[PDB]
Amino acid sequence: MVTAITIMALYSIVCVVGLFGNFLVMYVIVRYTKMKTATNIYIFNLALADALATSTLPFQSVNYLMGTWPFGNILCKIVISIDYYNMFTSIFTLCTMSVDRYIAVCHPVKALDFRTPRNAKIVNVCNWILSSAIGLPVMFMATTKYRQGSIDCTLTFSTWYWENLLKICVFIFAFIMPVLIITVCYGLMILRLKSVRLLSGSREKDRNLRRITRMVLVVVAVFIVCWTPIHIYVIIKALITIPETTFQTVSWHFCIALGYTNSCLNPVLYAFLDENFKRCFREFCI
């Protein structure tokens, strides 16, 4: 009742803002020649994944409102696969972004050869091909279960071995390891930046390098803050058999809502933190 209406209202507000913002970012990268850079190819992949993530939220809101899933099997298999794709592609795109900024900051002589944009495009295709290994099995499994009370849309496992295994793999490969890679790359970059007078010879090049590096760090931090609580909740629920109570249902939905909310936040940071994006957005609007 009240919870379903609240969810629908917030999801619709996160759906229109997110879809508009991430369409705008992609359009600007395509439209203006100056925008194309290795970092911009990586930012474009992030915003693709967030547009696909936000286009699903109306069906879920209707499902919560009506108590039943009326959209069929195939749309059930697409929505769930997209749910997993969001997590894997987003974490890997941030990881590759951080390694790219590491090569640029610490190995400039050899940074020049490997930072051509085509390399970034191949990197992004490889990221999607890798994420399919987790994504496609989830799509194949998902099903519409005809519960007597109402139709459900869920994942069918062959149960303890096959279900705890999926949750563990998601916790390890799509969370802990990329976070360690990112933390080590930023520790080494912070070491380089603290003790160098100039990073690229030219003063302007130095300032540009430090600005892009800070923007990428802020995006990474925001994503980690939005996604950590749902990840911990899944583990703490698996091992404890929490009793069912109002607090449990409300807290659970709130953590899922935060994780989805992150999809609309990034286009605003691009505009506040990048002069080129801010300029293109103003020129687009006017």
Partner: protein, 65 residues
């Protein structure tokens, strides 16, 4: 004749005297200037110093009276 520096500075980089008489790098490479990591000691001549206010900020220069 010293060219001391004060204020909020994250890092101080190259210090010098300009009438280009002398340059002292932070390490101590010199182009008779001795610098202690916060002053350097060496026609009117003017103190020059390079600095960065923050880790992500841009290289600046400050002259003297």
């Amino acid at each position: 004749l010293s060219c001391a520096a004060s204020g909020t500075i994250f890092r101080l980089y190259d210090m010098g005297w300009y009438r280009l008489v002398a340059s002292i790098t932070s390490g101590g490479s010199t182009k008779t200037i001795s610098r202690d990591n916060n002053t350097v000691y060496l026609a009117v001549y003017y103190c020059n110093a390079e600095y960065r206010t923050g880790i992500w900020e841009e290289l600046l220069d400050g002259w003297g009276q």
